[PDB]
């Protein structure tokens, strides 16, 4: 759920998922086509692929729990779906944080028409 993931992002980046990453690049939004604009965008690309590999789940809606062990992110013992959804979000948020040094304001509110050609996971 955008809830737990939203909290992960705000904790790892110090930024609100809405709207710092909700309209970013070609993949940190909704759909997604074309070449990711940068590392942060690639993060969302990989994030989509991760969700894409959970056909048996509801990555976006379904919810889960999680905690933090003296610094790092720690996914709790839930249903595999919730355990994996958690790992997909943890990797993206840490990916975001990792690449904060290249986060670009110009990639926010990115018009999708500028995103062409479906890249493969």
Curated annotation (Swiss-Prot):
Disulfide bonds join 28-44. It is found in: Secreted. Expressed by the venom gland. Ca(2+) binds at residues 27, 29, 31, 48. The active site is at 47. D.russelli pulchella is synonymous with D.russelii. Belongs to the phospholipase A2 family. Group II subfamily. D49 sub-subfamily. Snake venom phospholipase A2 (PLA2) that shows weak neurotoxicity and medium anticoagulant effects by binding to factor Xa (F10) and inhibiting the prothrombinase activity (IC(50) is 130 nM). It also damages vital organs such as lung, liver and kidney, displays edema-inducing activities when injected into the foot pads of mice and induces necrosis of muscle cells when injected into the thigh muscle. Has a low enzymatic activity. PLA2 catalyzes the calcium-dependent hydrolysis of the 2-acyl groups in 3-sn-phosphoglycerides. Monomer. This is Basic phospholipase A2 VRV-PL-VIIIa. The chain holds residues 1 to 49 of 121 of the full protein.
